[PDB]
Amino acid sequence: KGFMITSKTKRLKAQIPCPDLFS
Amino acid sequence: MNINPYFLFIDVPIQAAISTTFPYTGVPPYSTGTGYTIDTVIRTHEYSNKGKQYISDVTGCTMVDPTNGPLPEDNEPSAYAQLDCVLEALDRMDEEHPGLFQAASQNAMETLMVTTVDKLTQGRQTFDWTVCRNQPAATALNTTITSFRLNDLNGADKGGLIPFCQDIIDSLDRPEMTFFSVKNIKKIKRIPMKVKDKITKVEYIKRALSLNTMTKDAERGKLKRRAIATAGIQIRGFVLVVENLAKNICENLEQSGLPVGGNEKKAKLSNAVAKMLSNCPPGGISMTVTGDNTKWNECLNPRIFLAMTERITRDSPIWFRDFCSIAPVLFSNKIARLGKGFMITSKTKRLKAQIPCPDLFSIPLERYNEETRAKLKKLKPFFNEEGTASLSPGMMMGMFNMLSTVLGVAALGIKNIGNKEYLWDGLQSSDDFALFVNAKDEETCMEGINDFYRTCKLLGINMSKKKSYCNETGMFEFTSMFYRDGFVSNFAMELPSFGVAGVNESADMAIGMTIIKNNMINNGMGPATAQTAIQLFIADYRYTYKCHRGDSKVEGKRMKIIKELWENTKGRDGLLVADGGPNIYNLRNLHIPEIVLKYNLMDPEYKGRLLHPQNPFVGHLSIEGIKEDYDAVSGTHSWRTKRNEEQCYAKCCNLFEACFNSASYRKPVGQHSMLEAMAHRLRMDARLDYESGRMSKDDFEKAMAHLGEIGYI
Amino acid sequence: PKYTVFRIGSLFVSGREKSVYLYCRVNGTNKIQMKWGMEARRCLLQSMQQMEAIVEQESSIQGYDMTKACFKGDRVNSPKTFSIGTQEGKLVKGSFGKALRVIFTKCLMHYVFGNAQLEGFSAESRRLLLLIQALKDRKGPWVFDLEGMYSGIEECISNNPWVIQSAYWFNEWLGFEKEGSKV
Amino acid sequence: ANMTEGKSKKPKTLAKECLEKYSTLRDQTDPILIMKSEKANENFLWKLWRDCVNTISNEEMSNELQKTNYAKWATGDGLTYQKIMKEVAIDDETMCQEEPKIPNKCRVAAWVQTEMNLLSTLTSKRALDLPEIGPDVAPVEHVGS
Amino acid sequence: TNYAKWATGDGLTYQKIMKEVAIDDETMC
Numbered sequence A: 001k002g003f004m005i006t007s008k009t010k011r012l013k014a015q016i017p018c019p020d021l022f023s
Numbered sequence B: 001m002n003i004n005p006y007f008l009f010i011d012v013p014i015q016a017a018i019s020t021t022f023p024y025t026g027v028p029p030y031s032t033g034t035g036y037t038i039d040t041v042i043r044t045h046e047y048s049n050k051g052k053q054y055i056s057d058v059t060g061c062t063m064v065d066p067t068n069g070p071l072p073e074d075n076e077p078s079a080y081a082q083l084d085c086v087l088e089a090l091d092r093m094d095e096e097h098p099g100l101f102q103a104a105s106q107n108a109m110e111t112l113m114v115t116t117v118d119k120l121t122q123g124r125q126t127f128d129w130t131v132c133r134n135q136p137a138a139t140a141l142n143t144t145i146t147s148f149r150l151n152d153l154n155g156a157d158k159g160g161l162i163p164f165c166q167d168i169i170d171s172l173d174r175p176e177m178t179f180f181s182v183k184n185i186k187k188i189k190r191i192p193m194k195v196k197d198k199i200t201k202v203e204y205i206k207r208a209l210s211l212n213t214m215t216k217d218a219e220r221g222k223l224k225r226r227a228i229a230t231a232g233i234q235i236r237g238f239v240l241v242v243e244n245l246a247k248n249i250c251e252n253l254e255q256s257g258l259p260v261g262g263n264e265k266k267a268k269l270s271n272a273v274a275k276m277l278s279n280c281p282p283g284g285i286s287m288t289v290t291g292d293n294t295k296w297n298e299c300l301n302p303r304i305f306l307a308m309t310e311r312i313t314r315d316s317p318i319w320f321r322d323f324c325s326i327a328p329v330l331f332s333n334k335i336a337r338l339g340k341g342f343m344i345t346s347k348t349k350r351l352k353a354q355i356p357c358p359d360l361f362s363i364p365l366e367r368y369n370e371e372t373r374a375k376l377k378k379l380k381p382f383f384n385e386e387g388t389a390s391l392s393p394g395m396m397m398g399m400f401n402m403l404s405t406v407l408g409v410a411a412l413g414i415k416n417i418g419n420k421e422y423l424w425d426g427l428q429s430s431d432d433f434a435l436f437v438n439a440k441d442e443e444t445c446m447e448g449i450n451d452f453y454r455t456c457k458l459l460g461i462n463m464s465k466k467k468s469y470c471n472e473t474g475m476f477e478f479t480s481m482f483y484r485d486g487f488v489s490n491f492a493m494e495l496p497s498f499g500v501a502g503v504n505e506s507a508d509m510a511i512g513m514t515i516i517k518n519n520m521i522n523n524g525m526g527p528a529t530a531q532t533a534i535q536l537f538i539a540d541y542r543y544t545y546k547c548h549r550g551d552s553k554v555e556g557k558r559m560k561i562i563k564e565l566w567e568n569t570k571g572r573d574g575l576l577v578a579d580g581g582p583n584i585y586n587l588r589n590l591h592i593p594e595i596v597l598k599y600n601l602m603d604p605e606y607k608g609r610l611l612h613p614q615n616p617f618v619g620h621l622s623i624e625g626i627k628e629d630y631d632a633v634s635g636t637h638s639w640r641t642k643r644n645e646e647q648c649y650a651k652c653c654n655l656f657e658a659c660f661n662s663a664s665y666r667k668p669v670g671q672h673s674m675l676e677a678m679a680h681r682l683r684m685d686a687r688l689d690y691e692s693g694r695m696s697k698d699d700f701e702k703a704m705a706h707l708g709e710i711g712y713i
Numbered sequence C: 001p002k003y004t005v006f007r008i009g010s011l012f013v014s015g016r017e018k019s020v021y022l023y024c025r026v027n028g029t030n031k032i033q034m035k036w037g038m039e040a041r042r043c044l045l046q047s048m049q050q051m052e053a054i055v056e057q058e059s060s061i062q063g064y065d066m067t068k069a070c071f072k073g074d075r076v077n078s079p080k081t082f083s084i085g086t087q088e089g090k091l092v093k094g095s096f097g098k099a100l101r102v103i104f105t106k107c108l109m110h111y112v113f114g115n116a117q118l119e120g121f122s123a124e125s126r127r128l129l130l131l132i133q134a135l136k137d138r139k140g141p142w143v144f145d146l147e148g149m150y151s152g153i154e155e156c157i158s159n160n161p162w163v164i165q166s167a168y169w170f171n172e173w174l175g176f177e178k179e180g181s182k183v
Numbered sequence D: 001a002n003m004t005e006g007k008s009k010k011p012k013t014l015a016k017e018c019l020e021k022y023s024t025l026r027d028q029t030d031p032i033l034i035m036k037s038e039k040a041n042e043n044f045l046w047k048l049w050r051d052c053v054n055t056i057s058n059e060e061m062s063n064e065l066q067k068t069n070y071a072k073w074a075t076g077d078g079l080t081y082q083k084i085m086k087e088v089a090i091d092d093e094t095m096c097q098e099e100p101k102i103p104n105k106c107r108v109a110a111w112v113q114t115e116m117n118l119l120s121t122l123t124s125k126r127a128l129d130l131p132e133i134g135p136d137v138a139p140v141e142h143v144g145s
Numbered sequence E: 001t002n003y004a005k006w007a008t009g010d011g012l013t014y015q016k017i018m019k020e021v022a023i024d025d026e027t028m029c
């Protein structure tokens, strides 16, 4: 599934798939 | 070499080049107004907080009375106008003008007796209590008339304004008040409909006395905004009569003069300067004070205006004296609706929410910013639970302009204090005044200016010391009009954007040319400026209506047919510009319609097509606006725009006009129902058609059957 | 400091290389702002009325029309000139056309940098301009309070480039006028 | 600059043709950032610019951007607060009123004088064209002309 | 219902955005 990145100030979440781990 | 525009003043007077100093080619400042309205209330009560504070029994609000209060002890604005001083000024004004008050009162009464209810349809957006909103004058008037029928108040049907205003006064006594309110139901669609709602007496009184507020828009020359207000229909007629009385008084006054328009301002300024200079004693000095009052309407009390109305109508029937005393009475007990509330946001949660004004104090004051915190803390005493603030003292802008001008001229007409060695006189108009003092030396002139300042303090009139200055007579400014050495340089009237009025091609062209010519006649527009204005207007006209010269390379839906007409038409200089024709307007022929101007050069078929008597682009009902004034012609370019108890009245009057084409032009006359007259004329029309063969036997039989169904056989 | 600028290429305007950058910026507008921007062309009108008045005055002083005389002169009148700027503390004169262009640019800048600050500054500085004119003509002007007027003018000088540059220019012109008063 | 016979064309077509003439700048797809202001995303702005160029150069005739979702966040539109009913605002003790933002106090800048100097100079190109008016017969219209 | 959305914290949920925007944004981590 990959990892998850988040911005608390903007209150946004996104999922980075495994292929896009190094982008 | 570093360009410095101000250096242009080294070789030219500032007055001559003052036009460039004025920014009138950018965007005027535009705006919530809740903070500004609260600030206006706070300022108005601050200038009156040393007066008398009581509770209005009728409404329960907190009332402040600065009149006859302590005399000012500092140079801050003061509303403590002494009644005796105002009466002194008005008595002096009466003495210098024999029978002006009586003449104005008689004229106002006679005009009131003839004025009808429909006169209230003129004006701007008015407060509608039925919906507690702002709606056009006609909308508010018909809504009030309809809701008065439900309450057994049928004065509107009587015609004249006096019975309608009598029913308005009566409505304040009804224990309840029934009306039609817009209710939105979720059926998901939000459908609005009329519902028979009721409000008790006190709420109705509050609504009638209430004044809707907003932030004034496009007010150039001011860094910060202010609060503009609009009233309801309950005070419109009385305000109209009082303003008529004030205008009747102030047209005769030479200090104010009949409210001047166009280039009469130059004449007024020149006459004032010349008269004062002639009056100047031998070897004396005349000094002109260029004055400016800012927020001077916040120190004007409706009680003082009630006193002026009472004094002006000293010899009049009690009915008119009482009628003229109702606008000040309703303005002294006015209620200020406060904007739309404040907006509070949390950025750790990215949330926002508007706080409606009824709920201003439901939140702890610690959650407002410091300025809003202090504003609300000071506003709390005059806050009403329903989301409004009582504003007894002061007056909102634009309500009593003629009356305030009369008061200012009364202040001007004192002319001296203590038999001192100076005489003062000036011009007054709507918050703007200019003073002239003649004396024997500069010191005495300054003494006279100080005396005038102190006297104005006694009438509630405050003059801005920051905005007012003085110099020797011969150079000053008034109503944004700069006089210098006999030369007047009015350069604050922004020339209206020379673009199509957006009604239709023919009418728009006529309006634009007439506007340019009127500017030339009144506003001193020069030849070259007028020609460039014509060029700009023609450019905008061609851009809006996609009507460029047939010989141009522009493309479009209409331009293809214009190009076709360019070559299919032999006489090329006779085409209207809307048909790709060449413009032939110049300074000399700005007053002749281009339809006539090109009649001789039109091709034989082009005029027939354009002037085809029966062409589909014209309808009778579209002619209402032909008058309002521009001179034009009827033709294919005379079309109208699509339409984006309302429909009841609309269709009834449309049928009334259709049956009788005269009703559109001149008022019909009769003492009977419109229905019976309609039936009779329809019977006559059917008989004429049957006689002339335009109708068949069955059609006339059907018409008679329908008329009998109406019940007029 | 408000522009994110990239370097997108280079050009040969006249056979000489010149870098081509791309200035990127996020801004906001209102329909009223767009409308009033559509009416920037009135600057032209504002820039001609003024000049027309000037010519009219000259045409009043001497019978014949002075437009030709005002712009480039004639047999009996030299061309009109106006003080446009300064260099190294010495004022510089320029033709009527140069003053015309300066007036037009002034109106255009009033439009471009127009907001509440500019309106306030212009309105409040008009009073000081009229007071200075009264001083020049020896009309013996008086002020009921001067610090109030100065504060009202200065409260509008915060961040508008045109207002600040206009304040600088006003100070420079006021110094020049003081020197002229000395002589 | 693109020289043309004078035919008036839609702004989208004009921009497309001007970009086509300068193909090197249009096809530049590797940005060289010179300075990012304080907070602007270089990637957002550059991708938005590339979307603009692609939309202008596309064979279609509509000028609408083809992403409509990346552009939502590139322009900052998506970073907007969400309205909530007044009751929750009353009960939420952390929802306050934003303090007013005061304009910065700045000093004179040397670029305003340069702009004044440069803008009031004659150039080789004029963009001002106005319509025609009818002939002049009176002397007054002659002097106006 | 409208109140219960915020009282229980259900409304305070982070918005999901396309991975391209998140990758282009250096603030997300």
Ligand SMILES: [Mg+2]
Pocket (backbone or CB within 6 Å): B290, B291, B292, B432, B433, B477, B478, B479, B480
């Ligand atoms: Mg004034």
